[PDB]
Structure 1
């Protein structure tokens, strides 16, 4: 059940691909901002290489910190799937599987309308520790 997912996942050829990496020595993404065009199919490749031996995922939410906390809270209660958002979690646009240190995983999705959206990691504690970034979706 540890698998990618999200309301905007599509089985379509990506128009763009983007790489995200974990910070090697912190509970953070290496990229704290992303930018993509609206209504476009993108493959996001999350490469989790870190020196902590720690797990991480990439989760795009349909909003800011209030929505992020909601999605994060639903994932916190999904220990059997290693803390990814449960399927059909409200306002969770896309996520990768939860990746062990050394693992890489993608998610292919249609970006939402123009606007600003948080991406977070839902492994317990990481979102509260600051593991988040801002996706700005342009026209």
Structure 2
């Protein structure tokens, strides 16, 4: 199940990814390519350091941070994040997988996380 190279995309015009979960091996370099395949939406992907409580706080810092990237000033709670992609844009991010555990991924464009645009990165031991 575990993989070091992940391809993920938005689903149509909905506030959802085409993957709700993926697994990565701990301690190794991971490549994640996100494609905003929508025709009219803004999307990113943010992998946070922990679960739903961390994700909620990053989402709130994001909407306060505002346009155009909607990300917090620093990455203390972020494993990796793309920039805010327009329709048809894509980005590839790179990070050492952290300690084994479950890590929420989410889009921080306003209302999209609450709208269900989220998933879980499981990090295998």
Q: With structure 2 as the length reference, what TM-score do the two structures score?
A: 0.92
Instruction: For residue 80 of structure 1, give the secondary structure of its aligned residue in structure 2.
Output: coil
| Cα distance in 1 for residues equivalent to 2:73 and 2:8 | 22
| Cα distance in 1 for residues equivalent to 2:4 and 2:53 | 29
1:10-29 Cα shifts (integer Å, max 9, x gaps):
xxxxx932111100131001
1:110-130 Cα shifts (integer Å, max 9, x gaps):
111000110000000000001
**Does the CA-based 8 Å contact 1:71-1:89 persist in structure 2?**
no
May I ask how many residue pairs the two structures share in their alignment? 123
Q: Supply the RMSD in Å over aligned alpha carbons.
A: 1.4
Where do 5+ consecutive residues of structure 1 fail to align? 1-14
Where do 5+ consecutive residues of structure 2 fail to align? none
Instruction: For residue 102 of structure 1, give the secondary structure of its aligned residue in structure 2.
Output: coil
- Alignment of 1:55 with 2:45, yes or no, is no
Partner of residue 92 from structure 1, selected from 75, 78, 90: 78
Aligned to 1:44: 32
Query: What displacement does 1:137 show?
Result: 0.4
Moved over 2 A (4+): none
